[PDB]
Design a protein around this nucleic acid. Structure first.
Length: 46
RNA sequence: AGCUUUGCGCAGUGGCAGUAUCGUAGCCAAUGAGGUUUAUCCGAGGCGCGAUUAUUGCUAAUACUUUUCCCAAUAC
């Protein structure tokens, strides 16, 4: 179902539109925080 | 042709509070979250996890000496 994105404007259909609204608004700082957590929580000695 | 309403942006001028702000390729949620009162009634976010000066950035405070010139006859 060729819809319109209020973020980009591409023609995303009915079902994957919802996921688009969860990804297109995902905070870029979340990626940095998750990579920081991986780097900090996996370099620890037992 | 002004007047005006709603929502959304960009700003400007203020006021208020730092026990709160944000994140959520984690989960659940109008096919119903949560319900202590008004329950054959109300009606949205909630939980877990994470960051932190209980939002985050800047700006400023916490010192003087290198050089470079020299003495001499109108004489056996």
């Amino acid at each position: 179902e060729y819809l319109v994105s209020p973020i980009t404007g591409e023609k995303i259909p009915a079902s994957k539109m919802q996921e688009h609204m969860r990804i297109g608004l995902l905070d870029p700082r979340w990626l940095e925080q998750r990579d920081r957590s991986i780097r900090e929580k996996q370099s620890d000695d037992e």
